[PDB]
């Protein structure tokens, strides 16, 4: 109901959150690379980050770097279709949605995986923060595989009491872990974004990543470096 909600209606973006990934890319410039070719948007509904992905890599990109470019956006909620985006209605847990995503690429790994997913906050901060690190963890499942080694992973975080756990739990897997508010991010929100650059090495009703990151880490906290993003 702020600035960005009318500026979203003015540019045909599905939600105000579209500017968080834009104001993010005003830094890091992970979407201004002409070599950039395969991206995954997880928990994408209603799809404003996928629009930004479409506009940046097709509508505003020379025809010379549009080759093999492929955007697949996933949510368990059905999404209205987006030009140049393949929308999957599938669970990021489930079996062939990793194989399925991989088929729609030339079994090439993705250069960049993003997620702006968040459940509606309850007002109970410990629950809201834990639920958010749930969704980041399960999102990390597929990013662990499909992402090309040395490739970016972006996720929205609850920047609260236990965030320093998540950073250190993520120290094993990235070159430089960054944390960013943009400026379309409401002051009224504990919101921030964990922009993991340089995918480094992963490992080698059952056990999941949450419990094996909890396996190794455990009860330790580190502070990721901070990065403001917009201009």
């Amino acid at each position: 109901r702020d600035l960005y909600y009318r500026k979203a209606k003015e540019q045909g973006y599905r939600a105000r959150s579209a500017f968080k990934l834009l104001q993010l890319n005003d830094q890091f410039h992970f979407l201004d690379d002409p070599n950039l070719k395969r991206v995954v948007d997880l928990c994408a509904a209603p799809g404003s980050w996928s629009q930004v992905l479409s506009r940046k890599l097709f509508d505003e990109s020379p025809s010379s770097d549009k080759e093999d470019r492929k955007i697949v956006s996933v949510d368990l909620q059905p999404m209205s279709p987006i030009p140049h985006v393949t929308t999957l209605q599938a669970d990021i847990t489930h079996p062939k949605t990793l194989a399925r995503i991989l088929k729609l690429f030339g079994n090439e790994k993705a250069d960049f995986v993003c997620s702006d997913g968040a459940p509606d906050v309850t007002g109970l901060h410990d629950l809201d923060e834990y639920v958010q690190q749930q969704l980041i963890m399960s999102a990390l499942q597929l990013t662990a595989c499909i992402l090309k080694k040395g490739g970016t992973f972006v996720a929205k975080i609850f920047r609260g009491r236990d965030i320093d756990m998540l950073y250190s739990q993520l120290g094993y897997l990235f070159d430089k872990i960054v944390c960013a508010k943009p400026r379309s991010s409401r002051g009224t929100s504990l919101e921030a974004f964990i922009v993991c650059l340089g995918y480094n090495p992963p490992s080698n009703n059952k056990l999941c990543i949450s419990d094996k990151l909890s396996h190794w880490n455990e009860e330790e906290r580190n502070i990721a470096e901070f990065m403001a993003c917009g201009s």
Partner: protein, 998 residues
């Protein structure tokens, strides 16, 4: 540092044999609930809140919250301050916990629908789980029916309620039907039913044997957080984000198995959620625990407990007892309550008596003079009915206590009045009362009669001239004067000793129209304080002083909603109010912000009356051709065990600074302070310096949107701001014995955009001051506040660039007046405005001197210093100037979780240099929200969203972290510090409030 008190989210509550046990942040509170005494506070968890607890028959307490769990002895909880060493951390979030049937194991339900069976040291013995896909849970309970019959009841994110048998690891039901995530599941004790609730706002009743949905209930208007069966599984109680607790009947029939039927709605917590609930089947009492830190006791039989709470009579019911005596179109037009019951009068002047003892009505007498629009008044204490009409006729009747016999009667006609349209009465002294009568002819007199309480004869008659815009609406007496409430917020005071004296007229006390009550509160020296309510919701406390009279407004506020018909103080000094919101009568504790009773009246509510009785009130009213009697009994148990604070973010806190003034002695053991919240209110209260106990006084409601700042700028002035250019200057009065008072003195002129911050500098001894405000659009304005004209004059305006400006501060060094802002680009920007404002700076501690020139709007000069400090927006800004006021050190806490220390210096030629002295890049894990310098700049306390309070020391301009301590206050965003005389009191705000000592 030591933690002293906490008021904040209280997640669960349990009845246990005359105790209430409350999970209250990371503590357990044990109360004796019949007296509302806090027996002990015991900290169970280092930082986690207690989400759930239960007691074994033998006094062991099982408690969990997030990943924390503990088993602890009720005996210890009663006498130990902390038991955190018994806390254990499980790897997964714990959704629920219960004792095994014999209390030798515990069963832990995780958020992934696995049950850990543990021993009484909380060590795992084995795990039970289902086969199939994982389930993520937002709720669940383990229900123990017998030693081997344990049901795990899982509420999934996807909206299924999974009921499975613990020991066989066998799915019993997958209850589908809800539309959102499941936020609570419970089972009836008799094994018949499941109840679940979701954020689809429905409650669903399921058959546990068949797995079928029997009933969907929709009453709650927001997400539902908790529910349970009670009263031998015949009722359901639920508790919601809508701040209501709702009771439902389980109605069982042959053709449909059972159905939910809404029964009662209680609004019992502040915005917003309610988390805990439990019912004591014995006494039909409920306890609820809220986000606001309030613990509420609810009488589930407020309308049934004593058996005479609700009674109604139609005119036919009455005629069956008096006989067929009423004429066509004749109805009850007035009524009063006395010891024996009701005296009423009809539109044709029939006077009727209803006996509370016998339940019988009878015709008492007829007076045909009062078939002309009769009005009813009374002196309830002395069984005196007052009847008037529009023809200047009065009839007074006195009745015997039990007998109700007419023992005195008097009648008269006032020739001074042609037509009469209003009659008011008030008590006067031990032997008489007052009666006023008024007419609509402007040159007729306002008549006040002094009448004997013994034989109802006229002792004296006084005739006053009416001021121009005057229609009397209420009456009180005080010494030898009468205070007459009038329309247009007017109050006229007459002198009963001299009807030729010019009245003392107080005009426009509030934006409202009809003055509904004037009630004496207290007096001291030559001043008396009165409560004055206005029908449109405003109430004012005025101070009347005998010097000739003068008056001062001490307090002003508005009710949140609806008509305000009166207000009084109870025996505990709490401001009680009553009125209507559309159809609904309310009786409301305005000091602590909760409803005492409510009743649906006749929409118009043309005819109603309230009277005090022993152990409560009687509300009389006409609705839908019925005469209704509603008895409102004093609560069988206390109203609250904790009153609570805000239920939303506390964005700022300010302690009223210590003074050389006449602050009352009852406040000596503590401090008056304000909290300013995102709930748009400012709460004025007090805390005890040794115990940290908080008491509420007022909740100021002027602001339209969420508060940003509030600060006591001296011992009696306070400024608050919000957005949409709300900036209010308030005046505090703390001279009287029981409570402080606060009133608006002026609002800042307005040009949408918000006032992000402000600072003030005082003009020597004037009580005038300069004000700087900075706005969301980068604009900066400097104002002169002139006391005597009570106005804000704009004397400078400019703009930084285009980004928001979050903090601003006046710094006076040498003879220069500096303005320091902290834009969201992370710079410290300095302006030297000395030459462009008509004021002078005294060389030491920096006093302004008024040159008394006329107001021109200067333009803001270009900055004299621009220092980049932080990488993003600066959330906290503070400074301390050295002994010579030649330099000041500036402390900034950033949205980049960095902490910066800068030096602002002027040389012998008065040129400004801003140099940064140190910068701690990882001063916190998340946003730093507060940073205050203490002890002459030698130390620092910071607050941050990571809920770690950090203390720093500064040596040679370099910062080092010296102590750290976690708080439960989530989203920690406000901090206030006061010295004791050195030792410090810290007030910590976010979602909750904590008081600490350093």
């Amino acid at each position: 540092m030591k933690d002293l008190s906490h008021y904040g989210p209280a997640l669960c509550v349990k009845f246990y044999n005359d105790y209430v046990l409350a999970g209250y942040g990371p503590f357990i509170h044990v109360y004796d609930y019949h007296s509302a005494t806090l027996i002990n506070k015991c900290r169970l968890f280092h930082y986690n809140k207690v989400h759930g607890l239960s007691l074994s028959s033998e006094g062991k307490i099982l408690a969990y919250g997030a990943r924390s769990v503990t088993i602890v002895e009720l005996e210890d909880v009663l006498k130990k301050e902390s038991l955190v060493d018994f806390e254990r951390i499980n790897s997964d979030w714990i959704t629920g916990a219960t004792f095994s049937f014999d209390n030798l194991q515990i069963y832990l339900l995780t958020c992934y629908n696995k049950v850990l069976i543990c021993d009484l040291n909380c060590e795992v013995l084995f795990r039970k789980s289902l086969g199939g896909e994982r389930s993520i849970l937002y709720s669940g309970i383990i229900k123990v029916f017998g030693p081997d019959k344990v049901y795990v009841n899982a509420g999934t994110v996807m909206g299924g309620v999974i009921i499975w048998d613990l020991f066989s690891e066998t799915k019993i039901h997958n209850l589908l039907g809800h539309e959102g995530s499941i936020f609570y599941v419970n089972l009836s004790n008799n094994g018949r039913y499941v109840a679940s609730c979701s954020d689809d706002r429905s409650i669903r009743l399921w058959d546990l044997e068949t797995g079928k949905q029997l009933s969907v209930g929709w009453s709650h208007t927001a997400r539902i957080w908790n529910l349970m069966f009670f009263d031998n599984d015949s009722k359901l109680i639920s508790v919601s984000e809508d701040c209501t607790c709702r009771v439902w009947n389980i109605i069982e029939s042959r053709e449909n198995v059972a159905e939910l039927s809404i029964s009662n709605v209680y609004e019992v917590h502040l915005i917003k959620s309610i988390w805990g609930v439990d019912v004591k089947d014995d006494e039909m009492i409920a306890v609820t625990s809220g986000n606001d830190g309030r613990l509420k006791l609810i009488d589930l039989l407020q309308l049934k407990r004593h058996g005479d709470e609700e009674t109604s009579f139609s005119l036919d019911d009455i005629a069956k007892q008096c006989g067929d005596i009423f004429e066509k179109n004749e109805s009850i037009k007035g009524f009063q309550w006395f010891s024996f019951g009701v005296i009423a009068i009809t539109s044709l002047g029939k006077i009727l008596k209803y006996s509370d003892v016998t339940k019988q009505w009878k015709l008492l007498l007829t007076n045909e003079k009062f078939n002309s629009y009769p009005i009813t008044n009374g002196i309830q204490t002395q069984n005196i009915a007052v009847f008037s009409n529009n023809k200047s006729d009065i009839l007074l009747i006195k009745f015997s206590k039990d007998s109700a016999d007419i023992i005195e009667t008097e009648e008269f006609h006032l020739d001074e009045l042609s037509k009469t349209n209003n009659c008011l009465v008030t008590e006067y002294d031990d032997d008489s009362f007052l009666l006023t009568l008024q007419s609509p002819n402007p040159r007729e007199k306002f008549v006040c009669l002094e009448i004997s309480l013994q034989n109802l004869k006229i002792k004296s008659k006084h005739c006053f001239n009416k001021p121009e815009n005057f229609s009397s609406s209420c009456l009180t007496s005080f010494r030898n004067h009468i205070l007459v409430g009038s329309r247009f917020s007017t109050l006229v005071i007459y002198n009963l000793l001299d009807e030729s004296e010019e009245p003392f007229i107080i005009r426009r006390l509030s934006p409202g129209d009809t003055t509904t009550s004037i009630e004496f509160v207290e007096d001291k020296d030559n001043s008396a304080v009165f409560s004055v309510t206005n029908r449109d919701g405003y109430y004012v406390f005025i101070e009347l002083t005998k010097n000739r009279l003068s008056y001062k407004v001490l307090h002003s506020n508005k009710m949140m909603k609806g008509f305000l018909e009166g207000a009084f103080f109870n025996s505990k000094g709490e401001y009680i109010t009553y009125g209507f919101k559309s159809s609904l009568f309310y009786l409301y504790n305005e000091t602590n912000c909760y409803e005492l009773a409510s009743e649906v009246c006749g929409g118009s509510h043309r005819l109603w009356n309230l009277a005090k009785i022993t152990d409560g009130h009687v509300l009389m009213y006409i609705k839908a051709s019925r005469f209704h009697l509603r008895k409102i009994y004093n609560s069988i148990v206390p109203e609250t065990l904790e009153n609570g604070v805000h239920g939303r973010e506390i964005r700022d806190i300010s302690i009223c600074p210590v003074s050389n003034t006449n602050t009352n002695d009852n406040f000596k053991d503590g401090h008056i302070f304000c909290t300013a919240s995102e709930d748009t209110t400012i709460k004025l209260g007090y805390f005890n310096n040794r115990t940290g106990k908080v008491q509420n006084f007022w909740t100021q409601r002027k602001h339209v949107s969420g508060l940003q700042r509030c600060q006591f700028i001296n011992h009696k002035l306070m400024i608050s701001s919000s957005a949409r250019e709300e900036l209010f200057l308030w005046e505090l009065n703390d001279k009287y014995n029981k409570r402080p008072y606060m009133t608006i003195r002026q609002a800042l002129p307005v040009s949408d955009l918000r006032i992000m911050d402000f600072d003030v500098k005082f003009i020597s001894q004037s009580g005038d001051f300069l004000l700087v405000t900075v706005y969301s659009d980068s604009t900066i304005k400097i104002w002169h506040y002139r006391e005597n004209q009570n106005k804000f004059d704009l004397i400078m305006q400019g703009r930084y660039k285009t980004c928001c400006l979050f903090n601003v501060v006046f710094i006076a060094l040498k003879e220069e007046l500096l303005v320091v802002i902290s834009p969201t680009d992370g710079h410290l920007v300095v302006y030297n405005i000395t030459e462009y404002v008509p004021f002078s700076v005294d060389p030491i501690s920096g006093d302004l001197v008024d040159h008394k020139l006329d107001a021109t709007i200067s333009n803001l000069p270009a900055p004299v210093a621009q220092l980049p400090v932080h990488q993003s927006g600066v959330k906290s800004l503070d400074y301390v100037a050295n002994a010579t006021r030649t330099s000041a050190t500036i402390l900034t806490g950033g949205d980049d979780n960095g902490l910066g220390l800068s030096n602002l210096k002027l040389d012998d030629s008065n040129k400004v240099t801003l140099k940064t002295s140190d910068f701690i890049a990882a001063a916190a894990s998340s946003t730093i929200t507060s940073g205050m310098l203490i002890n002459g700049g030698k130390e620092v306390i910071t607050t941050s969203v990571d809920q770690v309070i950090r203390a720093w020391e500064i040596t040679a301009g370099k910062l080092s972290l010296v102590d750290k301590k976690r708080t439960t206050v989530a989203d920690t965003g406000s901090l206030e510090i006061i010295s004791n005389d050195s030792e410090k009191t810290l007030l910590i705000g976010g979602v909750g409030l904590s008081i600490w000592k350093k």
